[PDB]
Amino acid sequence: AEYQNIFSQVQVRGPADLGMTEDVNLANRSGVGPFSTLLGWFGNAQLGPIYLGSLGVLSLFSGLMWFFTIGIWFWYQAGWNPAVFLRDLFFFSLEPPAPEYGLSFAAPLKEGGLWLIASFFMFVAVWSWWGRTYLRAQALGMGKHTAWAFLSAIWLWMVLGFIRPILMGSWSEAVPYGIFSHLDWTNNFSLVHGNLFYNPFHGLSIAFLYGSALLFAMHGATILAVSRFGGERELEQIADRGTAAERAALFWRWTMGFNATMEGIHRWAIWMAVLVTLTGGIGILLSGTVVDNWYVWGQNHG
Amino acid sequence: DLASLAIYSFWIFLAGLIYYLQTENMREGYPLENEDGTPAANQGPFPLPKPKTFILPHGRGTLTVPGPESEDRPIALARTAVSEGFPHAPTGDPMKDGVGPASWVARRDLPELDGHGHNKIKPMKAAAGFHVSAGKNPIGLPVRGCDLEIAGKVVDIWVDIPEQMARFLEVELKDGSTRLLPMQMVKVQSNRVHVNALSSDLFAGIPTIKSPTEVTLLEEDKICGYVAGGLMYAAPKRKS
Amino acid sequence: ALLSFERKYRVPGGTLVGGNLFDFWVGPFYVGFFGVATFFFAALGIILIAWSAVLQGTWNPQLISVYPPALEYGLGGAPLAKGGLWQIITICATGAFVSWALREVEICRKLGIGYHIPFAFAFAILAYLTLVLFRPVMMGAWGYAFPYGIWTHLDWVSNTGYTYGNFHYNPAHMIAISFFFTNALALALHGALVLSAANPEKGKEMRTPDHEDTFFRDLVGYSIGTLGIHRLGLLLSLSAVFFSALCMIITGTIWFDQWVDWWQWWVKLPWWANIPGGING
Numbered sequence: 001a002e003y004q005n006i007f008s009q010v011q012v013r014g015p016a017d018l019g020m021t022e023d024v025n026l027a028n029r030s031g032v033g034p035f036s037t038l039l040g041w042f043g044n045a046q047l048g049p050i051y052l053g054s055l056g057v058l059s060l061f062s063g064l065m066w067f068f069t070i071g072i073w074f075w076y077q078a079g080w081n082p083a084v085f086l087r088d089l090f091f092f093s094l095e096p097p098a099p100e101y102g103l104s105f106a107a108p109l110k111e112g113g114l115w116l117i118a119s120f121f122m123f124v125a126v127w128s129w130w131g132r133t134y135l136r137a138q139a140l141g142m143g144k145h146t147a148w149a150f151l152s153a154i155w156l157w158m159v160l161g162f163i164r165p166i167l168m169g170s171w172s173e174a175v176p177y178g179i180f181s182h183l184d185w186t187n188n189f190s191l192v193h194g195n196l197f198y199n200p201f202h203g204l205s206i207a208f209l210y211g212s213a214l215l216f217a218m219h220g221a222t223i224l225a226v227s228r229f230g231g232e233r234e235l236e237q238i239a240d241r242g243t244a245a246e247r248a249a250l251f252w253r254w255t256m257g258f259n260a261t262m263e264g265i266h267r268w269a270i271w272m273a274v275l276v277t278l279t280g281g282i283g284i285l286l287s288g289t290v291v292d293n294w295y296v297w298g299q300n301h302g
Numbered sequence: 303d304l305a306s307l308a309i310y311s312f313w314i315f316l317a318g319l320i321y322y323l324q325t326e327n328m329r330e331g332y333p334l335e336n337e338d339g340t341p342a343a344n345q346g347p348f349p350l351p352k353p354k355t356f357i358l359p360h361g362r363g364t365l366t367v368p369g370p371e372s373e374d375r376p377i378a379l380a381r382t383a384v385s386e387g388f389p390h391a392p393t394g395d396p397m398k399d400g401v402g403p404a405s406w407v408a409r410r411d412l413p414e415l416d417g418h419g420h421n422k423i424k425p426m427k428a429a430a431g432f433h434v435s436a437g438k439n440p441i442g443l444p445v446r447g448c449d450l451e452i453a454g455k456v457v458d459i460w461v462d463i464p465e466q467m468a469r470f471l472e473v474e475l476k477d478g479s480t481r482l483l484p485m486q487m488v489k490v491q492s493n494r495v496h497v498n499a500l501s502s503d504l505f506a507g508i509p510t511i512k513s514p515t516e517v518t519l520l521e522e523d524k525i526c527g528y529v530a531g532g533l534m535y536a537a538p539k540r541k542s
Numbered sequence: 543a544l545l546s547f548e549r550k551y552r553v554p555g556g557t558l559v560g561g562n563l564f565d566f567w568v569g570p571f572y573v574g575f576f577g578v579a580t581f582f583f584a585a586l587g588i589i590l591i592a593w594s595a596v597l598q599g600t601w602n603p604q605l606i607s608v609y610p611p612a613l614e615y616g617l618g619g620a621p622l623a624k625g626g627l628w629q630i631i632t633i634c635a636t637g638a639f640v641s642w643a644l645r646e647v648e649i650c651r652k653l654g655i656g657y658h659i660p661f662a663f664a665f666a667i668l669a670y671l672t673l674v675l676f677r678p679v680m681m682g683a684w685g686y687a688f689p690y691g692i693w694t695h696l697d698w699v700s701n702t703g704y705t706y707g708n709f710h711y712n713p714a715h716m717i718a719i720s721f722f723f724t725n726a727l728a729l730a731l732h733g734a735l736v737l738s739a740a741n742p743e744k745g746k747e748m749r750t751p752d753h754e755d756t757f758f759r760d761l762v763g764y765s766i767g768t769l770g771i772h773r774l775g776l777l778l779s780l781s782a783v784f785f786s787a788l789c790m791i792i793t794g795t796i797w798f799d800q801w802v803d804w805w806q807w808w809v810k811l812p813w814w815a816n817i818p819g820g821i822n823g
């Protein structure tokens with residue numbers, strides 16, 4: 001057989017790569033971690049270094065406190081018993097306050113308060129991490145595409161957890177912290193809004209989610225097919241088109257009658273992904289605020 | 303109704319997005335041509351975008367696209383039909399001529415540099431602290447073509463320094479000279495390296511590199527082109 | 543018309559069937575034997591869909607639906623008006639998809655590239671065949687397949703799922719969803735990263751893959767690398783579809799009760815089954 005370039009035949013290693021410096025404050029970079037030969041079959045073997053400034057420590061700490069708050073509730077639901085904890089791990093749920101408390105923070109710990117505390121911690125965790133994604137780009141002099149793309153995921157999450165409940169006048173509209181409980185919430189939500197299959201933004205969201213699987217299968221497959229011409233060296237193919245980029249374009253031109261460029265496929269990539277949660281977030285925000293029933297809406301609006 | 307507004311707006315947006323996206327992807331290879339290289343009459347309904355310029359590192363200049371397209375090399379092919387849409391037959395040996403699946407692009411005849419401006423790909427012998435870390439070390443294995451004959455021996459791996467990966471095998475031939483083989487086109491076996499794409503007699507014709515310790519992007523394209531071309535053009539001498 | 547760099551690649555050869563007989567293009571499209579097979583299967587498919595519309599009595603694309611034969615027909619054939627067309631259209635579909643894959647293989651051979659694309663495509667085709675062929679055959683009736691219609695197939699998804707309660711509880715389906723979400727994550731990040739390097743801050747030089755690695759290590763402490771990420775995208779998306787097919791091949795065949803209840807195997811493991819407290823005691 002031809003070798004397929006899914007795993008590597010031979011790994012090489014050199015001195016720990018400490019990265020480009022540009023404007024980065026090097027006092028906030030760790031040392032390199034260990035090298036993993038296991039990872040090395042598929043990707044890079046090197047772990048670390050990581051940058052960890054003030055915003056990083058804040059984000060991580062807040063994130064852990066989020067995880068502390070859910071897990072202390074879980075253990076309490078477990079009656080402090082580790083057998084039960086493992087047995088019922090997926091059934092435990094930290095639920096938001098009842099409708100009766102509206103948007104107040106006036107609710108007992110065991111019946112709302114803790115949920116708010118957990119959400120407080122997540123909110124600080126996600127947003128500071130978002131800041132991290134912008135600032136690590138800035139320090140290296142790169143574009144802000146990552147921070148912008150991450151903002152689209154934040155959008156859906158903000159809508160589900162914060163914006164939609166505020167507009168609906170109660171925290172009770174938000175999602176519980178629990179594995180099974182949050183799946184139940186998802187199903188309920190659709191039932192109670194007349195079946196989200198009739199929400200056109202839900203449909204578009206699916207178009208893009210599937211679309212992302214299509215595009216990345218296409219793209220990844222394509223780069224691997226042209227890796228014998230150095231195709232994965234995308235930046236240098238952008239700067240100086242090679243037979244890799246040409247064979248890639250032409251595969252698609254000949255198959256489906258049109259094609260990409262080596263930079264431009266990444267614009268199709270970024271937008272395909274990002275629109276999942278953009279459209280998704282609209283679909284939910286509209287639900288119950290403006291449309292109570294997507295079946296019914298459908299009857300009246302094409 | 304606000305949802306009707308939102309969704310109507312969304313389609314308009316998505317239509318504009320696709321337009322934008324499609325035009326961004328015409329920054330190379332357009333305007334379209336006839337088979338004699340003159341500009342085709344029907345270019346499509348999408349116009350070419352306003353150009354952008356990439357500033358290249360290390361004093362290497364800029365790239366402005368779209369711009370004047372041009373192969374900057376001869377193309378040893380001739381028509382095989384009196385109308386559009388048929389294949390173009392090689393006028394000599396397609397492997398030597400670099401046409402077909404043996405094609406190469408006239409890239410810069412300089413090496414790709416890393417972030418510090420050092421050559422990206424170096425032979426391991428010249429690459430401080432680099433060594434094989436996992437898998438079977440090819441260095442020293444005899445190299446076998448698809449005719450089941452020995453074309454040479456592996457004398458080094460050429461490694462990507464910044465990405466720490468193997469990119470080529472350097473193979474010494476019966477006359478003492480060497481060639482690069484793409485790592486993606488060789489199977490490292492327990493007691494040999496096997497190269498399906500090329501018969502042993504075709505190894506001498508792999509394009510050579512002008513300096514023995516670096517490769518240029520032009521040189522990479524010729525090498526990688528030539529070796530891939532063998533899949534089609536060595537097929538008579540193949541026995542698989 | 544040709545892309546400016548295309549002619550040099552438009553050489554004879556690579557075909558799997560027919561030698562030089564179909565070795566030409568129409569505009570940008572490579573034809574080949576499989577181009578002709580594809581056209582014939584698709585054209586036949588569409589005509590038959592169009593005819594199915596006539597017999598349903600609609601021309602609206604939000605209303606045209608072709609339904610499989612009813613469960614009563616089993617794995618036999620049915621009258622065209624009553625499921626047969628679905629059956630023929632399904633053969634044309636399969637014919638067209640497979641022909642498209644093989645055409646792709648031919649394009650690969652002519653271009654001297656690897657066969658990764660059509661191999662990937664094969665995964666989609668298998669998901670399709672699970673829904674319309676493997677599962678129905680294992681369940682004993684073509685009526686278990688989804689119908690061809692923009693909205694009616696959505697009705698099938700929802701009815702099929704609620705047959706087994708909330709489908710979320712199907713565990714292969716949870717793995718499938720994770721792969722889909724992670725893939726989308728991966729695609730956002732990869733697109734964003736390459737563009738962030740190709741399009742750096744205003745006035746600056748293009749960044750390098752070293753910058754791309756540095757970015758991710760600074761952020762998460764790890765970089766998969768430029769070969770890795772394309773290996774990843776492929777693995778993620780293909781895995782999403784593999785577990786999608788798996789989660790349906792099992793549903794209605796090895797497991798056919800309510801998916802929520804499947805999880806009782808864990809909860810009832812004897813060492814903690816009878817311990818009081820928790821949600822389950």
Ligand code: BCL
Binds near residue numbers: 204208211214588692
């Ligand atoms: C995969 C699991 C379920 C299923 C669950 C869902 C759900 C849930 C949803 C869809 C939605 C869609 N599905 Mg479905 N769908 C299934 C099987 C299929 C098959 C198939 C041959 O197997 C096809 C062609 C489609 C096609 C479609 C589109 C009409 C719509 C957008 C998809 C998209 O963007 O995908 C990604 C692909 C791309 C981005 C590439 C573009 C592909 C285009 C859009 C395909 C158009 C096909 C055309 C309308 C069919 C007729 C062909 C002609 C007769 C020749 N589905 C199976 C049964 N599908 C969504 C919708 O809004 O429906 C109203 C939606 O919410």
Ligand code: BCL
Binds near residue numbers: 156185190197284
């Ligand atoms: C019975 C269930 C209902 C239903 C109810 C809902 C509801 C309710 C919702 C969806 C939503 C979606 N559904 Mg639906 N859905 C149904 C049927 C389907 C079918 C199908 C084949 O039947 C499909 C394919 C889909 C597909 C989809 C997606 C397109 C969409 C979510 C996108 C996404 O990426 O979310 C996942 C992405 C996120 C949640 C973003 C998260 C971002 C944050 C910032 C991440 C923080 C991480 C945190 C800090 C943890 C740290 C991790 C550390 C590494 C440890 N649904 C049926 C009809 N669906 C969502 C949507 O947009 O709908 C419009 C939604 O809200």
Ligand SMILES: CC[C@H]1c2cc3[nH]c4c(c3C)C(=O)[C@H](C(=O)OC)c4c3nc(cc4[nH]c(cc(n2)[C@@H]1C)c(C(C)=O)c4C)[C@@H](C)[C@@H]3CCC(=O)OC/C=C(\C)CCC[C@H](C)CCC[C@H](C)CCCC(C)C
Binds near residue numbers: 147277
């Ligand atoms: C655009 C659509 C998609 C998307 C995009 C997207 N997501 C993103 C981004 C982008 C562009 C980022 O830049 C950002 C990122 O940083 O990626 C690396 C992110 C991100 N998306 C994430 C998750 C995520 N995204 C999701 C979805 C999506 N993201 C969409 C499909 C989902 C779901 C549910 O589908 C999830 C779960 C995070 C990986 C990352 C955001 C990170 C963040 O906000 O973190 C704050 C929380 C913490 C810092 C807690 C840290 C705890 C540590 C694990 C320390 C552990 C120490 C311990 C003692 C050791 C042992 C424990 C372990 C064994 C667990």
Ligand SMILES: CC[C@H]1c2cc3[nH]c4c(c3C)C(=O)[C@H](C(=O)OC)c4c3nc(cc4[nH]c(cc(n2)[C@@H]1C)c(C(C)=O)c4C)[C@@H](C)[C@@H]3CCC(=O)OC/C=C(\C)CCC[C@H](C)CCC[C@H](C)CCCC(C)C
Binds near residue numbers: 635692783
């Ligand atoms: C395996 C992972 C993912 C994947 C990968 C993938 N898809 C691919 C490929 C790959 C690698 C291609 O090479 C190939 C391609 O050409 O892409 C441009 C393709 C492709 N994936 C496509 C679609 C597609 N892929 C999907 C999914 C996925 N594709 C996965 C998530 C989906 C959905 C619903 O999620 C869709 C809709 C096409 C754009 C393209 C294949 C085109 C093709 O086969 O063309 C030949 C056939 C015709 C032109 C028409 C045939 C007409 C039929 C005879 C009648 C219609 C019958 C149909 C069953 C009725 C549908 C009614 C619906 C409303 C339900």
Ligand SMILES: CCCCCCCCCCCCCCCC(=O)OC[C@H](COP(=O)(O)OCC[N+](C)(C)C)OC(=O)CCCC[C@H](Br)[C@@H](Br)CCCCCCCCCCC
Binds near residue numbers: 762764
């Ligand atoms: C989870 C959301 C995303 C956030 C993930 C990032 C969290 C990483 C956690 C931080 C690392 C904890 C260990 C301490 C860090 C550290 O200090 O250095 C450890 C070492 C080096 O040690 P030093 O001796 O230099 O340390 C000096 C500092 N002093 C002396 C002050 C202690 O640092 C490292 O190597 C970091 C290695 C982390 C690798 C991270 Br966890 C990678 Br593998 C996670 C990949 C993230 C993928 C996200 C997508 C999906 C996730 C699923 C996959 C697991």
Ligand SMILES: CCCCCCCCCCCCCCCC(=O)OC[C@H](COP(=O)(O)OCC[N+](C)(C)C)OC(=O)CCCC[C@H](Br)[C@@H](Br)CCCCCCCCCCC
Binds near residue numbers: 258259344345
């Ligand atoms: C999502 C919708 C479902 C499917 C919609 C698309 C159907 C397949 C796409 C059609 C294939 C088009 C290629 C054949 C047309 C053609 O001439 O060959 C390609 C030509 C060569 O022929 P000429 O341009 O010389 O001829 C011009 C024709 N007339 C006389 C009309 C001016 O290559 C080109 O330069 C034109 C490229 C067409 C661009 C195609 Br229509 C792109 Br915008 C379709 C994109 C569909 C993807 C949908 C993505 C979903 C949203 C993702 C957002 C991130």
Ligand SMILES: CCCCCCCCCCCC[N+](C)(C)[O-]
Binds near residue numbers: 070161177179
């Ligand atoms: C930020 C407010 C709500 C956003 C949605 C959070 C959904 C819960 C995620 C699954 C629960 C994870 N957990 C707690 C079980 O480990």
Ligand SMILES: CCCCCCCCCCCC[N+](C)(C)[O-]
Binds near residue numbers: 617620630632675
């Ligand atoms: C791959 C697509 C599957 C559709 C095949 C349908 C053909 C069924 C023909 C069976 C004829 C037997 N009989 C006598 C009961 O009609």
Ligand SMILES: [Fe+3]
Binds near residue numbers: 234732772
């Ligand atoms: Fe890429």
Ligand SMILES: [K+]
Binds near residue numbers: 426428429430431432
């Ligand atoms: K060395």
